[PDB]
Design a protein around this motif. Sequence first.
Motif, mmCIF file in Angstrom:
data_model
loop_
_atom_site.group_PDB
_atom_site.id
_atom_site.type_symbol
_atom_site.label_atom_id
_atom_site.label_comp_id
_atom_site.label_asym_id
_atom_site.label_seq_id
_atom_site.Cartn_x
_atom_site.Cartn_y
_atom_site.Cartn_z
ATOM 1 N N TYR B 187 1.026 -1.217 0.032
ATOM 2 C CA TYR B 187 0.050 -0.082 0.005
ATOM 3 C C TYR B 187 1.065 1.274 -0.093
ATOM 4 N N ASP B 229 7.115 -2.895 6.106
ATOM 5 C CA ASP B 229 6.052 -2.226 6.215
ATOM 6 C C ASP B 229 6.277 -0.610 6.423
ATOM 7 N N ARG B 230 7.602 -0.316 5.837
ATOM 8 C CA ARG B 230 7.783 1.174 6.005
ATOM 9 C C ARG B 230 7.092 2.100 4.849
ATOM 10 N N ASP B 231 6.681 3.151 5.439
ATOM 11 C CA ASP B 231 6.123 4.213 4.454
ATOM 12 C C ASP B 231 6.840 4.448 3.532
ATOM 13 N N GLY B 232 6.244 4.647 2.252
ATOM 14 C CA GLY B 232 6.777 5.082 0.835
ATOM 15 C C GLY B 232 7.911 3.731 0.529
ATOM 16 N N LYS B 233 7.832 2.643 1.043
ATOM 17 C CA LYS B 233 8.519 1.301 0.762
ATOM 18 C C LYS B 233 7.510 0.272 0.280
ATOM 19 N N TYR B 234 8.009 -0.687 -0.493
ATOM 20 C CA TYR B 234 7.418 -1.904 -1.050
ATOM 21 C C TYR B 234 8.302 -3.071 -0.930
HETATM 22 NA NA NA Z 1 5.278 0.307 2.465
#
Ligand code: NA
Lengths: 40, 256, 64
Positions: B187, B229-234
């Motif tokens: 996400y 699950d870091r923001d801006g990572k996938y």
């Molecule tokens: Na992420």
Amino acid sequence: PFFNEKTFGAGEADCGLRPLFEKKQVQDQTEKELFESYIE
Amino acid sequence: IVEGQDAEVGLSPWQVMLFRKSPQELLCGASLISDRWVLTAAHCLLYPPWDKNFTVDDLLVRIGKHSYERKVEKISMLDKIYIHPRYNWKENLDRDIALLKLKRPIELSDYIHPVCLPDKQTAAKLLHAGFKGRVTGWGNRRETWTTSVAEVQPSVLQVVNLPLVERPVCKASTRIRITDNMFCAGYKPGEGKRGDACEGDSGGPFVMKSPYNNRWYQMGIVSWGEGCDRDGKYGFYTHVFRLKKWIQKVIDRLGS
Amino acid sequence: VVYTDXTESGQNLXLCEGSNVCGQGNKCILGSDGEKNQCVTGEGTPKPQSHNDGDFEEIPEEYL
Ligand code: NA
Ligand SMILES: *[C@@H]1O[C@H](CO)[C@@H](O)[C@H](O)[C@H]1NC(C)=O
């Protein structure tokens, strides 16, 4: 058959059909979400 | 699995745990693709930076596990390890794929059942940005902990559903060179939802259900991530369909 | 593999600058307090693999 059954073994013809779900015409708790993603 | 839920019993009957013999510990996820063959990531088997190069005597696989679940789980030895010849661990895990051959064919059960591998049509229909697949494993429920790893470890198999992300967005999220043998899912920040694979989930499957034939297909192998699950990572995943020719080669070789 | 945060200077194959792996051929100079970390050219040591999940019930001795 994409694999030769002789070296691959049994399993290709019936793959991806879960005995506790699809085999019973029953849906798991979240698969609806997956299909919604294709449609909406 | 970060931000997932306890899987129902029999949800993922192709789920396999790769296990070190001594000491006993979970090494990676894996998947069952026939009565005899198990798919995982190369890096689960061979990883020079950690001085890792397993032989068949080092490993067991466990199948039909939900949580020793006897009369339900099967433990198998390995006959042979096969690592993609062009597996490039030096850069960032190009071709992160491996096959394990079971010592002996196993019986199928309510809890043990192979996944389908995609073909051309499957890949064309299913691989589109925004379409959700599903990741399962026994790995950490969080990237970090306060006291002990023990605290982020699940009691039962976790599941999470995550959307395929556009290539340009995948490339923009990281400085690592992304190849055509990888895809990313997860996400975006400020979507309503979270989730990711984490430590101990790698080698495990990313599957999608076909609307067309009601069958489950492994489009991915959990391969790598910068954090969980870091923001801006996938999460990045081995593109199984793109590597299918190698899979076929190995399995169809005489006396494999 | 999951790249997590460098825990001492000299490490690589770990997150050094923000959420970016500091790769092979490089090493991570850990910022002290108020300092940023820096990923620099140099030989680094891979951040060791974290103690795996070794918490399972014992399986039959037959599987050894
Ligand atoms: Na992420
Ligand atoms: C992998 O280990 C096997 C020993 O069975 C050896 O043939 C091969 O050359 C090894 N590769 C590395 C990087 O150690």
